[PDB]
Amino acid sequence: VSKGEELFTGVVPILVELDGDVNGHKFSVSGEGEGDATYGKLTLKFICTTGKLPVPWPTLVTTLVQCFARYPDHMKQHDFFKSAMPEGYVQERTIFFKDDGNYKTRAEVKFEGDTLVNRIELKGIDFKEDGNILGHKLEYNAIHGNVYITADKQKNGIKANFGLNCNIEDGSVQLADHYQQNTPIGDGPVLLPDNHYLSTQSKLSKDPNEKRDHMVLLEFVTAAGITLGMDELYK
Structure with missing residues (x-):
């Protein structure tokens, strides 16, 4: 029904725009x-x-x-995200930093011409000014984890949960627990998935010629957790 996956067979330019406010400190990325x-x-x-x-x-x-x-061939019918394209989807999260504040985010991800645009509003509240977050005590390290997706049939979309560890300068870890929901923007057909996960690895680096406050990201994201079918033929 949807043919949104066709939009992703090659290299696609991406644009991200974030407007943020954490404890009243406002910023744009x-x-x-x-x-x-x-x-x-x-x-x-x-x-x-x-x-x-x-x-x-x-x-x-x-x-x-x-x-x-990357959704492997055997599990392409479980890719909600591309099915919602080009009209796109809303992605909303609440992110809890253990013993500190939380972020609430709302984004729309959709095509604008041939560019895939993610536009986000982020509000963070209840942070400690001397904590690991407002205090900039986290190391600038790789992040990896598994995003566990489930269908949300009532909302014609998906939910997900995951937990990430952020290494603190002093050697300990800062947990960031993420709750996520995605719903389509359009009224057209979408694919609702069985339970599965996205294995994500993010590498963080710096442009050695860039003096502005910035981040270079190289990331790999692979879906997994749907069986190949050997148990679906009969006994």
């Missing part, structure tokens, strides 16, 4: 890059264009396009 869902591969560069990010870059990675996941 813009990013550009491209994604190649054939390989689940994303390459992006972000700048905090208001000048100075008031939270650590690693806390914004997950908020700053799972439509670029």
Whole structure:
């Protein structure tokens, strides 16, 4: 029914625009890059264009396009994200930082011409000014984890949950627990999946020629967790 997956057979330019406010510290982030869902591969560069990010870059990675996941052939009928294209979807999260504040995010991800645009509003509340987040105590390290997706038939979309560890300068870890929901923007058909997960690896780096507050991201996202069918033939 949807043919949105056809939009992702090659390299697709990506634009990200975030407007944020954490504890009243307001900021903007813009990013550009491209994604190649054939390989689940994303390459992006972000700048905090208001000048100075008031939270650590690693806390914004997950908020700053799972439509670029590589869904293996045997599980293509479980890719909600591309099915919603080009009209797109709303992705909303609440992200809890253990013993600290939370982010609430709302984004729309959709095509604008041939560009895949993720536009986000982020509100963070109840942070400690001397905590690991407003205090910039997190290391600028790789992030990896599994995003566990389930259908949400009532909303014609999906939910997901996951937990990530952020390494603190002092050696400990800062947990960031994510709750997610996605719903289509359009009224057309979408694919509602069986339970599965996205295996995501994000590598964070710096452009050695870039003096502005920024992040270079190289990421791989691969779907998994649907069986191949040996148990679906009979006994």
